[PDB]
Design a protein around this ligand. Sequence first.
Ligand SMILES: *CC(=O)NCc1cccs1
Length: 161
Amino acid sequence: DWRCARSMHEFSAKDIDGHMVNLDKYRGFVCIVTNVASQCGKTEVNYTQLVDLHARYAECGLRILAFPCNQFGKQEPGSNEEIKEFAAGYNVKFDMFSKICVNGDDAHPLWKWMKIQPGILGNAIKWNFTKFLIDKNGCVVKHYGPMEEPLVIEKDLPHYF
Ligand SMILES: *CC(=O)NCc1cccs1
């Protein structure tokens, strides 16, 4: 199963409108995969800067996959519809997915896989707005914790475009 995967492209997820998406559609694209929340203290900085990154690098093949998750201080308590409306107010044009879990046996297998990409202890997602940078082949090449503002990622992007 997911432990054996070598690429994000092997997985699928429900977009925020409810339709299944084969993530192999991102082959050739450089992706930021992040878990988002609407009522976190860092909601405003992350949404705005992810929208800014997307506005400036999407034409180059930057893509952003945002997975809502209510596991961190219960700061994504709303429905998939309320979340999609919330993101529209920040002018989000990147890809929103249906709410998931990122930690636990019920976690989306994509997230189970990303968390073990190069010890067994301590890989749990720690708060809202963890960011994984995925290369064009679907490999995890960097992890930025919830303290890293998305614009920190900008200087690493050239190495993978
Ligand atoms: C936006 C864009 O595509 N710029 C040219 C590229 C340089 C490296 C990969 S794409």
